[PDB]
Ligand binder design. Sequence first.
Ligand SMILES: [Mg+2]
Ligand SMILES: [Mg+2]
Ligand SMILES: [Mg+2]
Ligand SMILES: [Mg+2]
Ligand SMILES: [Mg+2]
Ligand SMILES: [Mg+2]
Ligand SMILES: [Mg+2]
Ligand SMILES: [Mg+2]
Ligand SMILES: [Mg+2]
Ligand SMILES: [Mg+2]
Ligand SMILES: [Mg+2]
Ligand SMILES: [Mg+2]
Ligand SMILES: [Mg+2]
Ligand SMILES: [Mg+2]
Ligand SMILES: [Mg+2]
Ligand SMILES: [Mg+2]
Ligand SMILES: [Mg+2]
Ligand SMILES: [Mg+2]
Ligand SMILES: [Mg+2]
Ligand SMILES: [Mg+2]
Ligand SMILES: [Mg+2]
Ligand SMILES: [Mg+2]
Ligand SMILES: [Mg+2]
Ligand SMILES: [Mg+2]
Ligand SMILES: [Mg+2]
Ligand SMILES: [Mg+2]
Ligand SMILES: [Mg+2]
Ligand SMILES: [Mg+2]
Ligand SMILES: [Mg+2]
Ligand SMILES: [Mg+2]
Ligand SMILES: [Mg+2]
Ligand SMILES: [Mg+2]
Ligand SMILES: [Mg+2]
Ligand SMILES: [Mg+2]
Ligand SMILES: [Mg+2]
Ligand SMILES: [Mg+2]
Ligand SMILES: [Mg+2]
Ligand SMILES: [Mg+2]
Ligand SMILES: [Mg+2]
Ligand SMILES: [Mg+2]
Ligand SMILES: [Mg+2]
Ligand SMILES: [Mg+2]
Ligand SMILES: [Mg+2]
Ligand SMILES: [Mg+2]
Ligand SMILES: [Mg+2]
Ligand SMILES: [Mg+2]
Ligand SMILES: [Mg+2]
Ligand SMILES: [Mg+2]
Ligand SMILES: [Mg+2]
Ligand SMILES: [Mg+2]
Ligand SMILES: [Mg+2]
Ligand SMILES: [Mg+2]
Ligand SMILES: [Mg+2]
Ligand SMILES: [Mg+2]
Ligand SMILES: [Mg+2]
Ligand SMILES: [Mg+2]
Ligand SMILES: [Mg+2]
Ligand SMILES: [Mg+2]
Ligand SMILES: [Mg+2]
Ligand SMILES: [Mg+2]
Ligand SMILES: [Mg+2]
Ligand SMILES: [Mg+2]
Ligand SMILES: [Mg+2]
Ligand SMILES: [Mg+2]
Ligand SMILES: [Mg+2]
Ligand SMILES: [Mg+2]
Ligand SMILES: [Mg+2]
Ligand SMILES: [Mg+2]
Ligand SMILES: [Mg+2]
Ligand SMILES: [Mg+2]
Ligand SMILES: [Mg+2]
Ligand SMILES: [Mg+2]
Ligand SMILES: [Mg+2]
Ligand SMILES: [Mg+2]
Ligand SMILES: [Mg+2]
Ligand SMILES: [Mg+2]
Lengths: 146, 205, 118, 64
Amino acid sequence: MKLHELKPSEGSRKERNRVGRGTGSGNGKTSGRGHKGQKARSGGGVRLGFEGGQLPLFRRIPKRGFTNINRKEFAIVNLDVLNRFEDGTEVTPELLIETGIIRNEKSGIKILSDGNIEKKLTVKANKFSAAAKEAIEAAGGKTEVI
Amino acid sequence: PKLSLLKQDGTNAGEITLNDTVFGIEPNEKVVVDVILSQRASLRQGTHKVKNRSEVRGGGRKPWRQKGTGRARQGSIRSPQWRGGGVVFGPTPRSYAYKLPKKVRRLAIKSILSSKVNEEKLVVLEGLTFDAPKTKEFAAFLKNISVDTKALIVVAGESENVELSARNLQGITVIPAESISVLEVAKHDKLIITKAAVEKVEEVL
Amino acid sequence: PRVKGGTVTRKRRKKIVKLAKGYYGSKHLLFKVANQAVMKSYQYAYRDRRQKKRDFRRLWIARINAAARMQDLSYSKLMHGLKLAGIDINRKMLADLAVNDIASFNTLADSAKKALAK
Amino acid sequence: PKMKTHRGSAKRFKRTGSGKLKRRHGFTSHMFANKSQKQKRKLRKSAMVSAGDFKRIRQMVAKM
RNA sequence: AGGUUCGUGGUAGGAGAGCGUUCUAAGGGCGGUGAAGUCAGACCGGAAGGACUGGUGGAGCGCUUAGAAGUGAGAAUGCCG
RNA sequence: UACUCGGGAGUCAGACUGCGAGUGAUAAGAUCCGUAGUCGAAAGGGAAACAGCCCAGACCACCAGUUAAGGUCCCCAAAUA
RNA sequence: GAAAGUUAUAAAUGAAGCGGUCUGGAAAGGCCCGCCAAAGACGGUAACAGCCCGGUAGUUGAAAUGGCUUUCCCUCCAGAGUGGAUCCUGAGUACGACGGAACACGUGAAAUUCCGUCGGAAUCCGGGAGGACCAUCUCCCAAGGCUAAAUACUCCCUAGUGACCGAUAGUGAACCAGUACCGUGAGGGAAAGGUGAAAAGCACCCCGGAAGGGGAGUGAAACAGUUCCUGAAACCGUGUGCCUACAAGUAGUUAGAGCCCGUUAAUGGGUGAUAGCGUGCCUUUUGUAGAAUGAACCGGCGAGUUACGAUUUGUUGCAAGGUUAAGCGGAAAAAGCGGAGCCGUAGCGAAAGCGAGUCUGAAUAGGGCGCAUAAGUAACAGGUCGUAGACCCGAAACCAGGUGAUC
Ligand SMILES: [Mg+2]
Ligand SMILES: [Mg+2]
Ligand SMILES: [Mg+2]
Ligand SMILES: [Mg+2]
Ligand SMILES: [Mg+2]
Ligand SMILES: [Mg+2]
Ligand SMILES: [Mg+2]
Ligand SMILES: [Mg+2]
Ligand SMILES: [Mg+2]
Ligand SMILES: [Mg+2]
Ligand SMILES: [Mg+2]
Ligand SMILES: [Mg+2]
Ligand SMILES: [Mg+2]
Ligand SMILES: [Mg+2]
Ligand SMILES: [Mg+2]
Ligand SMILES: [Mg+2]
Ligand SMILES: [Mg+2]
Ligand SMILES: [Mg+2]
Ligand SMILES: [Mg+2]
Ligand SMILES: [Mg+2]
Ligand SMILES: [Mg+2]
Ligand SMILES: [Mg+2]
Ligand SMILES: [Mg+2]
Ligand SMILES: [Mg+2]
Ligand SMILES: [Mg+2]
Ligand SMILES: [Mg+2]
Ligand SMILES: [Mg+2]
Ligand SMILES: [Mg+2]
Ligand SMILES: [Mg+2]
Ligand SMILES: [Mg+2]
Ligand SMILES: [Mg+2]
Ligand SMILES: [Mg+2]
Ligand SMILES: [Mg+2]
Ligand SMILES: [Mg+2]
Ligand SMILES: [Mg+2]
Ligand SMILES: [Mg+2]
Ligand SMILES: [Mg+2]
Ligand SMILES: [Mg+2]
Ligand SMILES: [Mg+2]
Ligand SMILES: [Mg+2]
Ligand SMILES: [Mg+2]
Ligand SMILES: [Mg+2]
Ligand SMILES: [Mg+2]
Ligand SMILES: [Mg+2]
Ligand SMILES: [Mg+2]
Ligand SMILES: [Mg+2]
Ligand SMILES: [Mg+2]
Ligand SMILES: [Mg+2]
Ligand SMILES: [Mg+2]
Ligand SMILES: [Mg+2]
Ligand SMILES: [Mg+2]
Ligand SMILES: [Mg+2]
Ligand SMILES: [Mg+2]
Ligand SMILES: [Mg+2]
Ligand SMILES: [Mg+2]
Ligand SMILES: [Mg+2]
Ligand SMILES: [Mg+2]
Ligand SMILES: [Mg+2]
Ligand SMILES: [Mg+2]
Ligand SMILES: [Mg+2]
Ligand SMILES: [Mg+2]
Ligand SMILES: [Mg+2]
Ligand SMILES: [Mg+2]
Ligand SMILES: [Mg+2]
Ligand SMILES: [Mg+2]
Ligand SMILES: [Mg+2]
Ligand SMILES: [Mg+2]
Ligand SMILES: [Mg+2]
Ligand SMILES: [Mg+2]
Ligand SMILES: [Mg+2]
Ligand SMILES: [Mg+2]
Ligand SMILES: [Mg+2]
Ligand SMILES: [Mg+2]
Ligand SMILES: [Mg+2]
Ligand SMILES: [Mg+2]
Ligand SMILES: [Mg+2]
């Protein structure tokens, strides 16, 4: 590489900007801070939501709802990712995890009917949408629920 | 891809075939620069420290009355503007090491190890062994094959006394075929690699 | 790594002092005073490059006037004759003839009188 | 240290599918005799945070 | 790389291009036939700045391409001499 | 030139002059509004001097020319028109 | 209580140029020749040394004392199966009421643990918990005790390292430093490095009481002579080229005669009789020459940084995918392994839930949010923000432990 001739990619590195080094640089005396405020002091400014005394926005609109503790969320697979399988095989959740379609199994595998399928497949899963079930039935396949 | 195999005494020994995907790709100069800096930035200890105004010995007492004395208002004899006072920001113990995504650190080794081939600065050798450690015998071997500059001997196995009878020589470094890295290869001009070490480099990538 | 100041502060300050050579008193010795004088001298010199062009043109006019009055004319009524006759000699050259080669100045003034009459 | 979420805002804001924030109208507690029903029908729906407020409160809810 | 048109006052402030300082890596260098430092000159560039020659000094120091910062002072009734 | 989205600010003590009003006494270099200009952030020329009035907007050099407000007996360039 | 091995506490041996020549006070330097290397680490020697010295790599070494590791010696040892009438399994405790505390949990629907005061169980057909509580089910036996390793720290000892400092810096302290000095006391707390390679540290003569000088001598250098390398600026002097005693001066600038010189040689340098124009620098202000503020002068020191997160722009790798964290490995490396996890690929709803749709609604209505109309992710660099003293200096005050009635 000839360490005496290193040249990094153009635009990948810029130069730090240092304020308070004379008036020729445009950031001299006051250093981009203005004149004599609360924001012009060391460690100044107000909180993230503070509005100078007027009631903050979050304190004039109501809270809403609760959080269910038994919440169930399913891993989602569409129909388009189901065209990578040759017709005939039985698609099962333990097969889907290895091929990179499903990283983690949250609470079950659910097939949705986005896109379209063209190969006759037999699938197994935990949930099916109404439109997804008919799509694989109209392809000659069968629907089974584990 | 294709190179001439050389015996230890400096003569010919046939020819060798190097894999194209390892020693024949188009180098990525903009990647090798990044990897060299990252490995060089990760070699510094970063052991440096100064004393603030709360660590210098003394202080506490207010030197003199706030008003009426005629001197400037002061709060401690270890303020930053005083003589023996503390530093304001200064340095502090700090780590500099960082890494780069693995698919990039593997492209750089392919680029630097293939850039040598394009420059005809790689020498493949049949087998490099010495029965007894002898630096006199090693320097003569560097005369059989014209080196006259900094080198980097990469040996895989056997090599009874190669690591010993090259320590005293200055521009020569020996690494046992798994320690090959971007910084070391770029640092040394030539590259002497034995036949048995090419496969081990090849198989890892 | 620490960067102690040295050989850089005095190199810049000494250059300013040498530019204040010949000033009265401390203005040629002390940096703070000499800095203010060097800055002020530049501001003067900048605006006398404008006044220098005005100061000389007033000098040439006063010399053409004095020479023109010797021929029963005045500056205002002479410079009108030249334009009305087509002569485009500027003030700097006209004043040069009035002092050194007054013989030719009269030849120019005669043409000015002819233009005024006709 | 990683910066903390504003728990007060996290209890009454909702993140939509385009990164914007959804809220609730705020005049709906205890004076319903003084409001016409046209004024009460609109107040029970849900609105969106304006660009001026979002420009100020975007960091209070970032990992929400 | 070359043309045409329109422009080039400026505080708070925004954007860009750069000089100089200490240290590190590689290349390539000078120095008891005199290094850094220091003193004087009427030299060079658009600016920060950079050379050359001569005196003193008596042993270290530049240049190129990158990297990192205890990074540049005229003012704080600023601290020390 | 507008408009939309995004990164970064500073400002929220204004002043005088012409015009239209309020308070005041149809006073104030007063106070409070609307409207235009200049200063703030603007050097140059004229009002003797004189931030806000009149003319007019400085990229650098010239011992070149024509004009604006204002002027042409002397100080002081130009009509004792 | 013994035997053996290893280690720590002194050390031994240890290759190769007095090579030639030049400058030089002096060779380790330049040029030309050789040699060693399991030894080209570091330091010294009259300037920069692998081959001059102490040494280095390698190989050896323990009288005595301590440490560790094995063996011997010594010391101490009942565990399996079936039955299972009857007997035992931690009492003023476990719980409860009242008042407090710790639990991320502020008495709240408040489980769990602890303390003070009162009340007060069962005991194998028994007892406790699963965030009030009851029934079922599951798991487990409190109110007795012991226990190595993985974890935190460094007053110390040995070997080392640094894109750490280099005498106002680095510890307060490179020097007889917690010293001198200040205070009744607790307590506060400095300044101060460099002759030369080698003292060879100036026999001797002259002025003087001495100090201090002028020659002589040593030395490469005495303009290195016991604050001694280098020796800037303020400040104080001696000599001299030009100007100055009728003049009203932010001290200059432009025009300019006379006099005097001679350069990094070019429409050059020093001083300037006389003429025009001309009310310092900073801060703060509508507005300052301001009779508003700061500075006696010179020199050194003195203010937007770092760690972890958020967001946005630029660059690079891969791409419906992207990427590892802790850890193993190793040279304070580089690979390899590690997919636990995180972001993205689907949204809507308070929630059950439905899903390219969903929610409100009696509704195939209308409308809100979404797809249609689809690029993310890891790393680095710049701008900004959050938590940290957070840009630098500055209060009057508050609280906690101590020292003071010698005034
Ligand atoms: Mg910049
Ligand atoms: Mg500015
Ligand atoms: Mg300033
Ligand atoms: Mg200020
Ligand atoms: Mg402000
Ligand atoms: Mg303290
Ligand atoms: Mg205190
Ligand atoms: Mg200190
Ligand atoms: Mg240093
Ligand atoms: Mg300084
Ligand atoms: Mg003078
Ligand atoms: Mg949701
Ligand atoms: Mg309600
Ligand atoms: Mg401009
Ligand atoms: Mg900027
Ligand atoms: Mg060098
Ligand atoms: Mg230096
Ligand atoms: Mg010199
Ligand atoms: Mg330079
Ligand atoms: Mg330099
Ligand atoms: Mg600094
Ligand atoms: Mg003083
Ligand atoms: Mg904007
Ligand atoms: Mg307002
Ligand atoms: Mg106002
Ligand atoms: Mg107003
Ligand atoms: Mg008025
Ligand atoms: Mg007024
Ligand atoms: Mg007023
Ligand atoms: Mg304007
Ligand atoms: Mg202003
Ligand atoms: Mg003006
Ligand atoms: Mg004016
Ligand atoms: Mg007047
Ligand atoms: Mg005037
Ligand atoms: Mg202009
Ligand atoms: Mg005219
Ligand atoms: Mg006249
Ligand atoms: Mg020996
Ligand atoms: Mg030896
Ligand atoms: Mg000689
Ligand atoms: Mg020699
Ligand atoms: Mg050495
Ligand atoms: Mg020497
Ligand atoms: Mg030496
Ligand atoms: Mg209980
Ligand atoms: Mg209780
Ligand atoms: Mg039970
Ligand atoms: Mg329960
Ligand atoms: Mg539980
Ligand atoms: Mg127990
Ligand atoms: Mg010190
Ligand atoms: Mg010193
Ligand atoms: Mg005492
Ligand atoms: Mg000495
Ligand atoms: Mg003597
Ligand atoms: Mg005597
Ligand atoms: Mg004597
Ligand atoms: Mg002598
Ligand atoms: Mg001699
Ligand atoms: Mg000398
Ligand atoms: Mg000498
Ligand atoms: Mg010396
Ligand atoms: Mg001295
Ligand atoms: Mg001096
Ligand atoms: Mg006179
Ligand atoms: Mg010369
Ligand atoms: Mg004058
Ligand atoms: Mg005022
Ligand atoms: Mg003040
Ligand atoms: Mg003062
Ligand atoms: Mg000072
Ligand atoms: Mg992977
Ligand atoms: Mg819509
Ligand atoms: Mg900040
Ligand atoms: Mg007492």
